[PDB]
Amino acid sequence: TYKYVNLREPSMDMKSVTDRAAQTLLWTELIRGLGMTLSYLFREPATINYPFEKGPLSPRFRGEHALRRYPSGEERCIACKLCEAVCPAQAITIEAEPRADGSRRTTRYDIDMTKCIYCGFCQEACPVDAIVEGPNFEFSTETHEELLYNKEKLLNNGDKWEAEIAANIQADYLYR
Amino acid sequence: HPAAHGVLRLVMELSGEMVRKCDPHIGLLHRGTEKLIEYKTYLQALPYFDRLDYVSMMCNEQAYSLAVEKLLNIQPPPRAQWIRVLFGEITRLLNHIMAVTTHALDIGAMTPFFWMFEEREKMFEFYERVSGARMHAAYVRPGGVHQDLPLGLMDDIYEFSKNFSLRIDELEEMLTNNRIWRNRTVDIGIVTAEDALNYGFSGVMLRGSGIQWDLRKTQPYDVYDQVEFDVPIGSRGDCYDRYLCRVEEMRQSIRIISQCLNKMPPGEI
Amino acid sequence: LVSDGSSRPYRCKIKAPGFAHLAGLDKMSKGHMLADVVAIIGTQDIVFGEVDR
Amino acid sequence: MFMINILMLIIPILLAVAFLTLVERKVLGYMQLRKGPNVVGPYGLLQPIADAIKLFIKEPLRPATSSASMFILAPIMALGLALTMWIPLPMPYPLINMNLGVLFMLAMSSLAVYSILWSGWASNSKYALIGALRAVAQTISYEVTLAIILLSVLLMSGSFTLSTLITTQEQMWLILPAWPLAMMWFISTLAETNRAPFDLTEGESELVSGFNVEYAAGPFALFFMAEYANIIMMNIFTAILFLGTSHNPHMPELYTINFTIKSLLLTMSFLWIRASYPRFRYDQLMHLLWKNFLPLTLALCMWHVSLPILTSGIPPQT
Amino acid sequence: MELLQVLKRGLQQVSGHGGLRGYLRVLFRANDVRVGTLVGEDKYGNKYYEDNKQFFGRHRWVIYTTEMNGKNTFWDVDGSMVPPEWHRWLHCMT
Amino acid sequence: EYVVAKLDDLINWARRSSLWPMTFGLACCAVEMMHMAAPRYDMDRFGVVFRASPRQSDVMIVAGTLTNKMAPALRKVYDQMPEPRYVVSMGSCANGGGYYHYSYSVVRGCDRIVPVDIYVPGCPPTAEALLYGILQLQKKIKREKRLRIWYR
Amino acid sequence: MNLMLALLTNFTLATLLVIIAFWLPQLNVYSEKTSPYECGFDPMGSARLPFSMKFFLVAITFLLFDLEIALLLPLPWASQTANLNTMLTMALFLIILLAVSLAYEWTQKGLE
Amino acid sequence: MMLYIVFILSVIFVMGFVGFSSKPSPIYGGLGLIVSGGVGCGIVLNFGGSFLGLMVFLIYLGGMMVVFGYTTAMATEQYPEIWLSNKAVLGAFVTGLLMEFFMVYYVLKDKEVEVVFEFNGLGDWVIYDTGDSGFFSEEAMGIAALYSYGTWLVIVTGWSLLIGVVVIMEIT
Ligand SMILES: CCCCCCCCCCCCCCCCCC(=O)OC[C@H](COP(=O)(O)OCCN)OC(=O)CCCCCCCCCCCCCCCCC
Ligand SMILES: CCCCCCCCCCCCCCCCCC(=O)OC[C@H](COP(=O)(O)OCCN)OC(=O)CCCCCCCCCCCCCCCCC
Ligand code: SF4
Ligand code: SF4
Ligand code: SF4
């Protein structure tokens, strides 16, 4: 359909034009709002007082990585070379080679933490359900020699909290 | 400072006062995109459509995911689309909260920014609860929506919407008829011509200028046809009648979000 | 969106405004001051990285 | 000990101009819905001792391209005519008694803008060059709006001194009778001293940063402490020239007490604006003075001249 | 009228909170000085108060005390210290 | 003797408690900087007042993506800043370039161009791991200007 | 005799405070490279300042309205007289001689 | 703060001039004036005339000069070197400065030398006042406001200014 805005004409009669000459010359407008709508300061401030208080999130949040393990640990990753092949940024790097018993596992697993674009494509391709984006924004170290991760940085970083992780998926896994 | 969340360097030869010349240099953000999307598959290369602009998120990808379902001869199931109207028409509340304000931070005011972004936050939750992340969120796909939304949000959309038409009434008494602003914008940068078409402009700086056309009701998207709305229009081609679309275009949306909470049929995604 | 009949695409050519709404600054503003040209831009809603078009 | 009455003035004021900068963002904080500098204080009241010390540690570069002889005598001012102007200003007892002294402000109100023209020129090219030129041009056209509407009332009080101007406002708060003028006494000092709604001189929007752009932490405390030594003075003036208190030959002290609970309300006006209104685009900025502000100010002068004469009113002075 | 009304909460926010000792000490850590209602058990030295459910987002808060693990004493507080359980509580994820 | 090391509980507490950060808007990451100065998480008034001119700053901040044509601009701006300067990158594109890291027209990494100090990792860092990236930099002044004059 | 004691007191705090700010770290041992990198964000800028007129007149235009409001200044002393009609009839002339001098030029300010 | 605080101003004034009375690169010309004008308005504030002194600040030194300084950006000189620039200004200076000095030296360095410079005595300000008096606004230029007797003096100045603008509305 339509509408027309800013289409109006002044009335042009001496009952009006005072009302527009009691405005220009006496400032009866322009004190209407910012004489007032500004104050209106008397509302409670809204601030999350940071070092202590913190704000909301959701169980589907994304962040620092992990590699779980079952009960008594198997290093849940089977090195099926997938979370590697859907990765848009191509951070992941994986090198398998048959472990002594003959069950296969990894050797090098490196997520670069600069390239990773935080998809949620590597949480959703792993069929054996290993690699999982943690909900901890712990980060920010002082040397780029660092953020590159090896395998045996990840596991700890994913065994430091599994009380966080293992209780999110069981909220979220019923939807997908 | 006047970069508008971006980077440009423009050069003008002004005549002593009047500009009469300008010739900007864009190309500071190029990044090399369309050479890099021949090298990625279809579902792997989606986000580089979300990261294109910073403000509208689910409205991009609504324009990719509709350019793929075609070549596939496939439509989403009914509960797909009626999401893509609720988020699709909730981010028109973002770029219209920004382009009335972070435009008018150049005009120098303070509060119409620090007054609003209290609120543009209460929306960013609703990207985080539905899927994951703060802004860029990859949700729409070639197949309709990714995964269903939690038990909730329909008491956090409704409760939030019925509060909102008031805040948009604190950007009105603070702007429209405030003189020092009316005088900063009227009859300024008027293109009324049929060059304003000849250049092939898109929506607003059209619809606010007279010539009357919109791609929401002349073409269907994804069931967009079944809800009623009116397309505000402007009088004279200056700026302050391209502003006045972007208020009366934030007071149309709350009609649709209010009209689209009643209809969502159960079904797959 | 061209597509060659197999998995990876071929040209995917995006156009967003910013090749129009800023094609028309030089035209639009000739004859007003400099302290307008700051407040002309804001109405087109030019936001960049999009002009990666 | 007359020298210890002076130095008791210059020092105790540099604390206000310091601790204004804090109440700058608390009051302007709650307009935004938030709290003001908080973490460091505990209340914040301890912020400005940490800020005064970051600058003078922080290295004071000079442009290789500057003329150093001017790059000193200019700021070696922005702190004189700000601290001299305070001298003859009754509260209630001014340090000096100047016969005609009211006129002496305009002497020192007129001689500061000749410290802008130096600095912005002293340094270098077009952000402070033609950018410090055209803030000269607006600063001198808001005097003619001034000296007249200062000269108006002085027909309504009899003389040029300030000891009479407490006597005449006795039980009549001199803002009734000329309330049309009083408005223009306000928009002037806000337009002349480069504050919020006509902001252009110091840049944010129209340019990068006006006139401050070159000075690093070293000199730039002075200006940032000079520009706030004018603003709390004209506003510590207006309220001796309009909203009068009632002298008390007995408890002088209750004069100032009730006097800072006015001049300190009044000031909190240039902060209560700055949250609110936008800028003028330098055409509209002067273009609204000749056409609009001025014709009245003459017209009223033809009025306050006759009103005493036409009522047998003529105020008791020479 | 409003001089003694609200004032009766603050004088009980002071004189009934640690007296003078347990007040200036919780203010110098931050200006968070409001005393929540309940308490919490966990864990080492770090409490969790939790407010009465009269706020949203500033209703759930925390307290750091001293030298967690090979740590500087107090005025160093970062916020990666919370035990990896409360991420399921303090962040309002659940 | 001991006066020096007690003096640096002043000067090394002054420079850490007032910062005048420049910012660079370039790319997506700029918006999740704004919301640090919006009232929710309120950047200013926690000691750090927001943007000033290039000359008056201390800590510049790099958001966004740095193409070729922007490098000649940055390295110049980083200079003019006064002494006590730092560089805190943020976002997954100042760390080695997000993606675009294989492109032709993106510099790879923005450590290459300047001596960067603190990092933060992800498309937009969540407006949180920003401030917890600064409460690293206000804790990254434990340094002493003693023991250069006063040892060697 | 105490005015000049209240002036040279004021400058000498100010003319002191330049050196204790500008000069003191100016001889500090930091790097301070001589590179021609200074004069921010208009890197080179080689031109004369061209004559731009509507900058100029707003000088002249004032200077003349200025004079007579020195002539106009001694009204409030002159309100005490013998024959006063020669005042009101005369006083009101200057003003209208000022206001006329507007109305003419007011046909052309240009962009002021 | 002796009786010579007048004689010490003028001989700074007389030296206020010779700065810009030679050839100083006239962005320092101003700084040869606002000192001279300042000390000039200094001398006048003795003798009892006050109002008439404090005006030179308002109408001339404050108001006029700024126009003299608001240009010399329009006529703007070249950035050759300025001031000490060309090696020539310095030569002309001293011989002026000494010429009063060598005057001021033996003008009276002794009892008298000789006649034409000997009829000016010094040091008590012999003339500088007379007796006592009453008060009118002060006595002297306290009454400088005549819209009484002076009229044909104003109405020319009143009318001669009104034409000041018409001439300058044109050639501009
Ligand atoms: C018989 C006795 C005599 C009887 C006389 C009867 C009454 C006459 C007295 C009236 C005189 C009042 C003051 C003079 C009028 C106000 C000044 C004025 O004329 O403003 C005109 C201004 C021009 O605007 P306009 O013509 O519309 O052009 C723009 C179009 N886009 O239009 C405007 O609105 C400009 C508004 C002001 C611009 C700056 C405002 C910035 C905010 C500052 C407000 C704070 C001041 C409040 C006062 C505080 C006092 C303590
Ligand atoms: C950069 C570093 C180098 C510079 C360092 C020195 C800088 C000095 C700058 C001077 C600036 C202030 C000069 C303004 C002069 C104002 C004098 C004045 O107006 O005093 C008013 C008063 C009037 O007398 P009245 O009140 O009518 O009668 C009293 C009867 N008992 O008058 C009196 O009471 C009598 C006057 C007594 C004072 C003696 C004269 C003093 C003025 C000399 C100023 C010399 C000019 C210096 C350079 C000025 C440049 C701006
Ligand atoms: S997690 Fe899934 S994807 Fe990553 S390696 Fe183990 S199996 Fe292959
Ligand atoms: S996180 Fe995002 S980017 Fe890093 S690997 Fe998994 S998908 Fe690829
Ligand atoms: S990564 Fe950070 S910078 Fe690169 S695009 Fe995503 S947001 Fe903008």
UniProtKB/Swiss-Prot annotation, chain C:
Localization per Swiss-Prot or TrEMBL: Mitochondrion inner membrane
Lineage: superkingdom: Eukaryota
General function of this protein: Core subunit of the mitochondrial membrane respiratory chain NADH dehydrogenase (Complex I) which catalyzes electron transfer from NADH through the respiratory chain, using ubiquinone as an electron acceptor. Essential for the catalytic activity and assembly of complex I. Redox-sensitive, critical component of the oxygen-sensing pathway in the pulmonary vasculature which plays a key role in acute pulmonary oxygen-sensing and hypoxic pulmonary vasoconstriction. Plays an important role in carotid body sensing of hypoxia.
Family the UniProt entry places it in: Belongs to the complex I 49 kDa subunit family.
Subunit organization: Core subunit of respiratory chain NADH dehydrogenase (Complex I) which is composed of 45 different subunits. Component of the iron-sulfur (IP) fragment of the enzyme. Interacts with NDUFAF3. Interacts with NDUFAF7. Interacts with CERS2.
Annotated protein name in UniProt: NADH dehydrogenase [ubiquinone] iron-sulfur protein 2, mitochondrial
Lineage: Eukaryota, Metazoa, Chordata, Craniata, Vertebrata
Curated annotation (Swiss-Prot), chain D:
Pfam family, one: NADHdh
Membrane topology: Multi-pass membrane protein
The entry's keywords: Electron transport, Formylation, Membrane, Mitochondrion, Mitochondrion inner membrane, NAD, Respiratory chain, Translocase, Transmembrane, Transmembrane helix, Transport, Ubiquinone
Cellular component annotations (GO), alphabetically ordered: mitochondrial inner membrane; respiratory chain complex I
TM regions (residue ranges): 2-22, 70-90, 100-120, 146-166, 172-192, 222-242, 253-273, 294-314
Modified residues (N-formylmethionine): 1
Signal peptide: none
Class of this enzyme: translocase
An annotated Gene Ontology molecular function: NADH dehydrogenase (ubiquinone) activity
E.C. number(s) listed in UniProt: 7.1.1.2
Reactions catalysed, as given in the entry: a ubiquinone + NADH + 5 H(+)(in) = a ubiquinol + NAD(+) + 4 H(+)(out)
GO process terms (BP): aerobic respiration; mitochondrial respiratory chain complex I assembly
Functional description taken from the UniProt entry: Core subunit of the mitochondrial membrane respiratory chain NADH dehydrogenase (Complex I) which catalyzes electron transfer from NADH through the respiratory chain, using ubiquinone as an electron acceptor. Essential for the catalytic activity of complex I. Essential for the assembly of complex I.
Protein name: NADH-ubiquinone oxidoreductase chain 1
Source organism (scientific name): Bos taurus
Swiss-Prot record, chain E:
Residues bearing the modification N-acetylmethionine: 1
Keyword Transport annotated: yes
GO cellular component: mitochondrial inner membrane; mitochondrion; respiratory chain complex I
Keywords tagged on the record: Acetylation, Electron transport, Membrane, Mitochondrion, Mitochondrion inner membrane, Respiratory chain, Transport
Domain of life: Eukaryota
Membrane topology qualifier: Peripheral membrane protein
The keyword DNA damage is assigned to this record: no
Protein location: Mitochondrion inner membrane
Known partners and oligomeric status: Complex I is composed of 45 different subunits.
UniProt family annotation: Belongs to the complex I NDUFA12 subunit family.
Known function: Accessory subunit of the mitochondrial membrane respiratory chain NADH dehydrogenase (Complex I), that is believed not to be involved in catalysis. Complex I functions in the transfer of electrons from NADH to the respiratory chain. The immediate electron acceptor for the enzyme is believed to be ubiquinone.
Name of the protein in its database record: NADH dehydrogenase [ubiquinone] 1 alpha subcomplex subunit 12
UniProt organism field: Bos taurus (Bovine)
Range within the parent protein: 1 to 94 of 145
From Swiss-Prot, chain G:
Lineage of source species: Eukaryota, Metazoa, Chordata, Craniata, Vertebrata
GO annotation terms (biological process): mitochondrial electron transport, NADH to ubiquinone
InterPro entries for the chain: NADH_UbQ/plastoQ_OxRdtase_su3, NDAH_ubi_oxred_su3_sf
Protein's UniProt name: NADH-ubiquinone oxidoreductase chain 3
Family matches, as Pfam families: Oxidored_q4 (PF00507)
PTM sites of type N-formylmethionine: 1
Location relative to the cell: Mitochondrion inner membrane
Presence of the UniProt keyword tRNA-binding in the record: no
Residues passing through the membrane, by range: 3-23, 55-75, 84-104
Catalysis: reaction(s): a ubiquinone + NADH + 5 H(+)(in) = a ubiquinol + NAD(+) + 4 H(+)(out)
Origin species: Bos taurus
Family label: Belongs to the complex I subunit 3 family.
